């Protein structure tokens, strides 16, 4: 598997205002079509890890978090795996206030 747009995938620092939505993408291809899982600060990102939970759209390779709160701060990492290899990218999320 391989990043489709490796130049956008160099971006790592993301800041977003509270109570809005953060969206992270990691688009890929890889024979056979790889699957994607998400990590938060190293650990597996699971639905109960934040209040709203999180939504996905695999078909557009994206993790989504609505209503962000200062505790959503941290590192988010997409893992893309097929039978033949795993690729790895981290975004860093910051939350702005007022």
């Amino acid at each position, epitope marked *: 598997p391989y990043w489709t*747009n490796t130049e*956008k995938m160099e*971006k790592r620092l*993301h800041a*977003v*205002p*509270a*109570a*809005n*939505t*953060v*969206k*992270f*993408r990691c688009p890929a291809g890889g024979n056979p079509m790889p699957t994607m899982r998400w990590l938060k600060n190293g650990k597996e990102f699971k639905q109960e890890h934040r209040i709203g939970g999180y*939504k996905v*759209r695999n078909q*557009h390779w*994206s993790l*989504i978090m609505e209503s962000v709160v200062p505790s959503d701060k941290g590192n988010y990492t997409c893992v893309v795996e097929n039978e033949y290899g795993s690729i790895n990218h981290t*975004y860093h999320l910051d939350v*702005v*206030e*007022r």
Partner: antibody, heavy 127, light 108 residues
């Protein structure tokens, strides 16, 4: 309950001015935004403009730039549309909508979602 | 601008019917597309955002799909309160534009 109540509507003269108000309850928009969209009687929806307090951006439909001004008062939890130099074709129901953003590094823009609208106030411009 | 074209403009469907309304954009809008429902005299209500996300409180019989320049709003089993006018709206960095609307009448 999330509520948005619009007031300030009415019949006003061409060349004249009007201030619409958008009072919010059940939520604050200190870090989100407010949009205005209008609907001429019998017609479809027309975006008027938007201010986002979280990202600091303000933008208007070309048909409305420089005549209409969108502001907010956090103290009053209220948003405003100052309409100056009104013409007959500004005649419409004006809606305000709570507006948040989808922030994605992957693209060039903030995708804004107008998820909750007030019931609207009717503005009639006529001599 | 980014022109949005809805089809059909108006339609007559029976209760329980499956209804499809399509929205085409004059250029690629990705999945940056929202659908609104509006009953006459009231504010529009958001049904779907980002092409396929169902908004809170919106019944699951509404679903959205599409990307690029083609989008569809689906109503699987048309209920009596679903009779209204439906609007799509693209939400790119280009100035926001709406479709002209699709009005759904009740057949009897």
């Amino acid at each position: 309950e999330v509520q948005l109540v619009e007031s300030g509507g009415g019949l006003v003269q061409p060349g004249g001015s009007l201030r619409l108000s958008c009072a919010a309850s059940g939520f604050t928009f200190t870090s989100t935004g407010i949009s205005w969209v209008r609907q001429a009687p019998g017609k479809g929806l027309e975006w008027v403009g938007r201010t986002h307090l979280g990202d600091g951006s303000t933008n208007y439909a070309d048909s409305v730039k420089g005549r209409f001004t969108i502001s907010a008062d956090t103290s009053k939890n209220t948003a405003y549309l100052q309409m100056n130099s009104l013409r007959a074709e500004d005649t419409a129901v004006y809606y305000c909508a709570r507006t948040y953003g989808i922030y994605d590094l992957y693209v060039d823009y903030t995708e804004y979602v107008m998820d909750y609208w007030g019931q609207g106030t009717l503005v009639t411009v006529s001599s | 601008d980014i022109q949005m074209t809805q089809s059909p403009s108006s339609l007559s469907a029976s209760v329980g019917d499956r209804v499809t309304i399509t929205c085409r954009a004059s250029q690629d809008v990705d999945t940056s597309l929202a659908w609104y429902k509006q009953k006459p005299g009231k504010a529009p209500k958001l049904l779907i955002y980002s092409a396929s996300f169902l908004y809170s409180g919106v019944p699951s019989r509404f679903s959205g799909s599409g990307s690029g320049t083609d989008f569809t709003l689906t109503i699987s089993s048309l209920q009596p309160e679903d009779f209204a006018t439906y609007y799509c709206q693209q939400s790119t960095g280009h100035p926001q534009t709406f479709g002209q609307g699709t009005k759904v009448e009740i057949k009897r």
